[PDB]
């Protein structure tokens, strides 16, 4: 039941990464967004949280954007990847998808066909939608990217009794984190500015196109800052 020595390393090797289309961002991420982990992009208004969630669904459809050790992750495991986008804010825009696709050399329609978008209006729908993700897989959908944009808006606006909230939001995370592990996929969640989450960034604005993404929590990477801009191409630099 316990894994030791070489097994630990082999287990860590089944972890693949998704590129953000930003050199700096990827750099700070240790190579890219990690599968089997939950990565949070908390940030200020118009900081780009949503843009990254979009760019992420797009890059998922460009095979050269999935970095993984072939000796530990067969092409068959990352074949025909599909993303699940749980939209809590109603900020999903299929046109931003088309545009990002365009500038990346991807069939925008392919992205839309391989991305499941669930509109959630309350904390119950949110949690439930994240729970059905398994069924989706069970239906033969190779879910490899999950997006909860955002993660804490519903829970906040619904809850003194702030214990029920944490107790519930924690239950959501449990499902999310487990999801990431058993199905070897990347989990992304946003937060406008208490809960688990292996990676945590805080984004902000700079000079126009400019954005400053600060990585302040991860189990094996140092705190660092990546700089990128948002343009009609999506995330870039």
- Residues contributing to the annotated binding site for ATP: 43-50
- Nearest approach in angstroms of CB 49 to ligand ANP is 4
Cα separation, 142 vs 144, whole angstroms: 6
| Residue 177 interacts with which of ligand ANP, Mg ion, none, CB < 5 to 8 Å by class | Mg ion
Output phi, psi for 105, to 5 deg. 80, 45
Q: Which residues from 4-63 bind ligand ANP, rule CB under 6 A?
A: 43, 45-51
| Residue 191 binds to ligand ANP (criterion: CB under 6 A) | no
Closer residue to Mg ion (CB): 62 or 177: 177
Alpha carbon distances (Å) from 233 to 31, 77, 102, 221, 237? 21, 29, 8, 28, 11
| Residue 192 interacts with which of ligand ANP, Mg ion, none, CB < 5 to 8 Å by class | ligand ANP
Output phi, psi for 186, to 5 deg. -80, 130
| Residue 101 binds to ligand ANP (criterion: CB under 6 A) | no
| Residue 100 binds to ligand ANP (criterion: CB under 6 A) | no
- Nearest approach in angstroms of CB 36 to Mg ion is 5
Using CB atoms, what's the residue nearest to ligand ANP? 50
User: Can you tell me which of 125, 192, 204, 224 binds ligand ANP, judged by CB under 6 A?
Assistant: 192
| Residue 211 binds to ligand ANP (criterion: CB under 6 A) | no
Cα separation, 144 vs 79, whole angstroms: 10
Map 178-198 to HEC letters: HHHHHCCCEEEEEEECCCCCC
| Residue 46 interacts with which of Mg ion, ligand ANP, none, CB < 5 to 8 Å by class | ligand ANP
Peptide bond into 150 cis (omega under 30): yes
> In the Cβ-directed half-sphere of 215, how many Cα atoms lie within 13 Å?
22
| Residue 232 binds to ligand ANP (criterion: CB under 6 A) | yes
CA 30 to chain centre: 15
User: Can you tell me which of 14, 62, 91, 175 binds Mg ion, judged by CB under 5 A?
Assistant: 91
Q: Which residues from 114-173 bind ligand ANP, rule CB under 6 A?
A: none
- Nearest approach in angstroms of CB 48 to ligand ANP is 5
- Nearest approach in angstroms of CB 119 to ligand ANP is 15
Closer residue to Mg ion (CB): 60 or 179: 179
DSSP state of 3: -
- Nearest approach in angstroms of CB 96 to ligand ANP is 6
Alpha carbon distances (Å) from 69 to 30, 78, 118, 143, 177? 14, 12, 32, 19, 22
């Amino acid at each position: 039941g316990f894994k030791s020595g070489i097994d630990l390393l082999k287990q860590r090797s089944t972890v693949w990464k998704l590129s953000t289309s930003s050199s700096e961002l990827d750099s700070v991420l240790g190579g890219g967004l990690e599968s089997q982990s939950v990565t949070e992009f908390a940030g200020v208004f118009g900081s780009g949280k949503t843009q990254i969630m979009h760019q992420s669904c797009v890059n998922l459809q460009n095979p050269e954007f999935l970095f993984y050790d072939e000796e530990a992750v067969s092409k068959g495991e990352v074949a025909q990847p599909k993303a699940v986008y749980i939209d809590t804010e109603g900020t999903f825009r299929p046109e931003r998808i088309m545009q990002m696709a365009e500038h990346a050399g991807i069939d925008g329609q392919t992205v839309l066909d391989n991305t499941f978008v669930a509109r959630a209006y309350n904390s119950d729908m949110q949690m439930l939608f994240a729970e059905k993700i398994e069924d989706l897989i069970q239906e033969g959908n190779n879910i490899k990217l999950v997006v909860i944009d955002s993660l804490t808006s519903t829970f906040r606006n619904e809850y003194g009794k702030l214990a029920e909230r944490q107790q519930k939001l924690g239950r959501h995370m449990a499902t999310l984190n487990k999801l990431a592990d058993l199905f070897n996929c990347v989990v992304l969640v946003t937060n406008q500015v208490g809960h688990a989450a292996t990676f945590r960034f805080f984004v902000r604005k700079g000079k126009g196109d400019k954005r400053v993404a600060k990585l302040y929590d991860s189990p094996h990477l140092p705190d660092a800052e990546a700089i990128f801009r948002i343009t009609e191409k999506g995330i870039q630099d």
